[model samples]
Target: TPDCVTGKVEYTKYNDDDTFTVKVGDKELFTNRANLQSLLLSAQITGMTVTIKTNACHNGGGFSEVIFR
Candidate 1:
């Protein structure tokens, strides 16, 4: 997987509980980290979209690996 900051974020969706969500062309995925939250907020402020690949996140707990955007 690429670094959390490996590439530019192309999409982002702020979720409840202060977390964030991402989608790879309509393939929904869930992801949230403290730093990632900060970055997402940054993207929001700059009106940017974060890009994430489906396989970037870890797998377990019914969560498909979360690719943080």
Candidate 2:
């Protein structure tokens, strides 16, 4: 099962290597998926509401789904 988090984005970080991370509410979500990474790179997602779902493992598991509103 995937763990999901939903809230307004508070922070977003993108690295030169294409790693992406965002903080929504209190939890930090990350992703390295090419498509999602591209969206994050092109769009302004901060302060927007988002729903993120990822693998159950808490250690370095990147986001699988990122729903923005």
TM-score of predicted structure 2: 0.66
- Alpha carbon lDDT at 10, candidate 1: 51
| Candidate 1 lDDT, 1-69, residue by residue in tens | 442322444566777775566533444445656466666557656756455444444321113233343
lDDT values, one for every candidate? 0.48, 0.66
Cα error, residue 20 of model 1, in Å, equals: 2.9
Q: Estimate each model's TM-score.
A: 0.40, 0.66
* Candidate 1 residue pairs that clash: 9-49, 9-50, 9-51, 10-49, 10-50, 10-51, 11-49, 11-50
TM-score quality measure for candidate 1? 0.40
Clashing pairs in 2: none
